[PDB]
Design a protein around this nucleic acid. Structure first.
Ligand SMILES: [K+]
Ligand SMILES: [K+]
Ligand SMILES: [K+]
Ligand SMILES: [K+]
Ligand SMILES: [K+]
Ligand SMILES: [K+]
Ligand SMILES: [K+]
Ligand SMILES: [K+]
Ligand SMILES: [Mg+2]
Ligand SMILES: [Mg+2]
Ligand SMILES: [Mg+2]
Ligand SMILES: [Mg+2]
Ligand SMILES: [Mg+2]
Ligand SMILES: [Mg+2]
Ligand SMILES: [Mg+2]
Ligand SMILES: [Mg+2]
Ligand SMILES: [Mg+2]
Ligand SMILES: [Mg+2]
Ligand SMILES: [Mg+2]
Ligand SMILES: [Mg+2]
Ligand SMILES: [Mg+2]
Ligand SMILES: [Mg+2]
Ligand SMILES: [Mg+2]
Ligand SMILES: [Mg+2]
Lengths: 53, 216, 15, 119, 251, 68
RNA sequence: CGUGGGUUAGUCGAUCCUAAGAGAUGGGGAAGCUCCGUUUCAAAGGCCUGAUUUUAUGCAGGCCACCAUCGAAAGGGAAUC
RNA sequence: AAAACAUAGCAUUGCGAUGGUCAGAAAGUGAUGUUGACGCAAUGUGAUUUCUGCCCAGUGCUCUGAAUGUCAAAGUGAAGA
RNA sequence: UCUUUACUUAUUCAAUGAAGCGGAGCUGGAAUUCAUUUUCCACGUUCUAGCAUUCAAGGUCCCAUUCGGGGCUGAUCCGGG
């Protein structure tokens, strides 16, 4: 129950990873892939714009 | 230097969170600030009748400086000086005359040699009649940036008017030179100023709107 | 963790 | 003019003086409204109250209706020079308050009751 | 006589709207700098039923331009918008279903919905399920788009007034018969106390202009003047004509 | 004294001078609360003929009421 | 009928929270008893941290600003056998 | 306790918010409305099937219809001290 | 007398935590130096359910270098409608 989360140690409430007790493992994996790929495509977006100039 | 890097923010639409800018122009001020600002506006947007509009012209800074120079020589006795004078009980005093009822009475008797009228009296009807009256009685008058300034001349907070009836023979020529200057800007212009309506000034944005229709 | 608990730890160290 | 990063104007912080009165609010401070002699009105000496003295090591008092458990503990320690373990209280059907005061094991309720002088 | 049913409604006691389960008022974002000058992108996080309303709602999340935080709007979902879709709102947003454009910035023939009557009203026209407005013309001198409303009224609005591209979802709702009294009961349970309705002729004279008589009948014309007063306006108010419409109603 | 002139001016309520002051002031008063303390009399001549003096203990309030 | 005895809580309830709702204030109505409205066309507050070691207030900094309050002994809710 | 009311179904009417219907003594006031014509409001008929004729003189409702009939207060003209 | 139409400050409506209005620029783009600049158009975000906060890094100038601090610019100017 909500207030019982106050009595228990941090290992019961989390897991050892980015977004531990907040997002699931496959959700974190999609966030990482998407962050990596969109941030790369941004470098390509700018270069393609900078060539046309 | 090698550890440090240039990471410039893009504050275009839909990019970074905008930085803290000066929003003074947009502040929702307290109602009383709004009232006092909008009152100043409204009283220039409306066509202002001559008897009021004449108070827009005021004595220039150099002449005003020279006037206050003179009048400061005839400051009324302070509370301390009176306490001294009454132990002695003395010579004739020369002092700036003030009090709206007093001065109005002095002007009607042609005792005043120079009258100063504050430009910022509220309500205005305390002094709208004075230029006309001084003009009628042949009294030199100046409209001066004051109330508070004339206050200081007379050991008061404010004063509304101040006048000289007598000056010392030292400063007779000083007064006369000063009256000549003062007459040029007020009494000698009185009959022209009596005809000219003030106000009808547009705000910034409406002016621009008017200027863009003028050239077309 | 709640503010009241954070404040407790902060007092404990201030001694 | 000064820079204003918010478009909200708030009331300025302004000095707040403490009161410095020209005369006291009242002449004389009231004496303690609930001293020990007010907190403990009298012992309760029903046959069932007395059974608790003899057995449970519990004194049973009538007690001011304004008195809480902290004030009863403090009054009992003061008036009878005894150590209190716990206080249980109830408001009786006649509208007075009864306190069941258990002493610590070092004291005997029957001795102390004999001293205050109801057996 | 006594105060009739249609007059009791204005006091709004038992006749107020039943709003416990509603999601919030559907409204466009407040019209701000970004929307006036560029566009802002939001995400469709959820598409959700609103009690009382036919059309589903779309919870669209946008970043705040001036503070680090998110801002959930509640849009009425256009047919075809899906969870995860990005929505673009502003002067410069592209002409795709779900985007929010000023009506000046769209060609003649565009279908829009949740259109503002005045700029920044946050949405007014064509919000019920299956409805939309058609842009039919621009007047760029007067800065006025002309539009056809669901009713078939034509209307001139500011070209700065915004709309959403496409038709409100949940269309064809009123093609399924209700069949049972009970279905109408549950329909009106989430709206307001308007149902069931006693006919005025089944009442006594004290209760309604139509009441009374040794047969149920109206007894005077049922068409009532526009200048009639409260307590008299029952029947057909200010009717230009009456009887079965032999033809098409479109202009 | 001034107060004689003030008395006579205030009788000319459709003079251009007084029309203008009437317009500015009616606006300003409409902006404040329906009852509000006035700092000083707007008509000091009128106030004094009705009994006001400029002493500590005399107070002016301005109030509007609905017509009709 | 007369006279007495009898109800013991950190853990059970109330107390806290919000519901439909009720309702001050800012304001506006009303001759007025009062009416409207509940975040408004208001200058509407109160936290954090270090200290200073002067003292638990001004000072040092920062920080955020929504809008009283009442409304459940069956709703939500810290803890006992 | 019914053959009455409701009902789904059918049909009509009003209204695009500076709005319709309705509330309030008033209001910087309210309900519909957390609404927007697949909606809100006002009526009639009463599942399905089948059909729903003729009459716009009357009463009503309604009309970017003619005008010089009727026609208040204010205003205007003449007479008159 | 009517119809059409200007002005903005009264009055009226609406919105927001009163955040980017109005006028000039800068920058380009196209067009067109038709000698000459007159203008006109834009003036950082659109494969993707990621991320975006600490007076901003940078640049630059002062400070008295030190743990740092301050200004300017980055983010054009003007009018506080
Ligand atoms: K009902
Ligand atoms: K019915
Ligand atoms: K009838
Ligand atoms: K308890
Ligand atoms: K409870
Ligand atoms: K019918
Ligand atoms: K007929
Ligand atoms: K007829
Ligand atoms: Mg108890
Ligand atoms: Mg029906
Ligand atoms: Mg009957
Ligand atoms: Mg009747
Ligand atoms: Mg019958
Ligand atoms: Mg009738
Ligand atoms: Mg005073
Ligand atoms: Mg008994
Ligand atoms: Mg419990
Ligand atoms: Mg109330
Ligand atoms: Mg409560
Ligand atoms: Mg419970
Ligand atoms: Mg029976
Ligand atoms: Mg029936
Ligand atoms: Mg049938
Ligand atoms: Mg007449």
């Amino acid at each position: 129950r909500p207030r019982q989360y106050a009595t228990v140690s941090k290992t019961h409430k989390t897991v050892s990873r980015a977004y531990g007790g907040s997002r699931c493992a496959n959700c974190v994996k999609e966030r990482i892939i998407r962050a990596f790929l969109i941030e790369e495509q941004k470098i390509v977006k700018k270069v393609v714009k900078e060539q046309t100039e | 230097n090698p550890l440090t890097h240039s990471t410039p923010k893009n504050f275009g639409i839909g990019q970074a969170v905008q930085p803290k800018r000066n929003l003074s122009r947009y502040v929702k001020w307290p109602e009383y600030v709004r009232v006092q600002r909008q009152k100043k506006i409204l009283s220039i947007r409306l066509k202002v009748p001559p008897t009021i509009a004449q108070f827009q012209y005021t004595l220039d800074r150099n002449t005003a400086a020279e006037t206050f120079k003179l009048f400061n020589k005839y400051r009324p006795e302070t509370a301390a000086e009176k306490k001294e004078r009454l132990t002695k009980e003395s010579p004739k005093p020369y002092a700036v005359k003030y009090g709206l009822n007093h001065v109005v009475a002095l002007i009607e008797n042609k005792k005043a040699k120079l009258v100063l009228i504050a430009n910022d009296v509220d309500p205005i009807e305390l002094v709208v009649f004075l230029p006309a009256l001084c003009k009628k009685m042949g009294v030199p008058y100046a409209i001066v940036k004051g109330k508070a300034r004339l206050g200081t001349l007379v050991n008061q907070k404010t004063s509304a008017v101040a006048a000289l009836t007598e000056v010392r023979a030292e400063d007779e020529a000083a007064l006369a030179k000063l009256v000549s200057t003062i007459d040029a800007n007020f009494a000698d212009k009185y009959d022209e100023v009596k005809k000219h309506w003030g106000g009808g000034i547009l705000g910034n944005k409406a002016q621009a709107k008017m200027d863009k229709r003028a050239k077309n | 963790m709640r503010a009241r608990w954070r404040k407790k730890r902060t007092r404990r160290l201030k001694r | 003019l000064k820079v204003r990063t918010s478009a909200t104007f708030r009331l300025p912080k302004t000095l707040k003086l403490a009161r410095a009165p020209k005369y006291a609010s009242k002449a004389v401070p009231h004496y303690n409204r609930l001293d020990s002699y007010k907190v403990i009105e009298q012992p309760i000496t029903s046959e069932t109250a007395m059974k608790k003295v003899e057995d449970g090591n519990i004194l049973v008092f009538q007690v001011s209706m304004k008195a809480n458990k902290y004030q009863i503990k403090k009054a009992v320690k003061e008036l009878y020079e005894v150590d209190v373990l716990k206080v249980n209280t109830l408001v009786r059907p006649n509208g007075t308050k009864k306190a069941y005061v258990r002493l610590t094991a070092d004291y005997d309720a029957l001795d102390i009751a004999n001293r205050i002088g109801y057996i | 006589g006594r105060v009739i049913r249609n007059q009791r409604k204005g006091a709004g006691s038992i006749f107020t709207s039943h709003t416990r389960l509603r999601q919030g008022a559907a409204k466009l974002r407040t019209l701000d700098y970004a929307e006036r000058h560029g566009y802002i992108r939001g995400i469709v996080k959820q598409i959700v039923h609103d009690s009382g309303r036919g059309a589903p709602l779309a919870k669209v999340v946008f970043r705040d331009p001036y503070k680090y935080r998110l801002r959930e709007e509640i849009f009425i979902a256009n047919e075809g918008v899906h969870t995860g879709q990005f929505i673009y709102a502003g002067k410069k947003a592209s002409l795709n279903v779900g985007n929010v454009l000023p009506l000046g910035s769209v060609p003649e023939g565009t279908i829009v919905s949740n259109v503002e009557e005045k700029p920044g009203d946050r949405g007014a026209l064509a919000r019920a399920s299956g409805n939309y407005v058609i842009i039919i013309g621009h007047n760029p001198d007067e800065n006025k788009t002309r539009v056809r409303l669901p009713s078939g009224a034509k209307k001139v609005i500011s070209s700065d007034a915004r709309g959403v591209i496409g038709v409100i979802a949940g269309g064809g709702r009123v093609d399924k018969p209700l069949l049972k009294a009970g279905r109408a009961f549950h329909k009106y349970r989430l709206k307001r106390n308007s149902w069931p309705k006693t006919r005025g002729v089944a009442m006594n004279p004290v209760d309604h202009p139509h009441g009374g008589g040794n047969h149920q009948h109206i007894g005077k014309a049922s068409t009532i003047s526009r200048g009639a007063v409260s307590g008299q306006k029952a029947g057909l108010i200010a009717a230009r004509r009456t009887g079965l419409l032999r033809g098409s109603q479109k202009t | 004294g001034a107060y004689k002139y003030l008395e006579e001016l205030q009788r000319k309520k459709q003079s251009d001078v007084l029309r203008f002051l009437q317009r500015v002031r009616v606006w300003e008063y409409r902006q404040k609360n329906v009852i509000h303390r006035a700092a000083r009399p707007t008509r000091p001549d009128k106030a004094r003929r009705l009994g006001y003096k400029a002493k500590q203990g005399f107070v002016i309030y301005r109030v509007r009421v609905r017509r009709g």
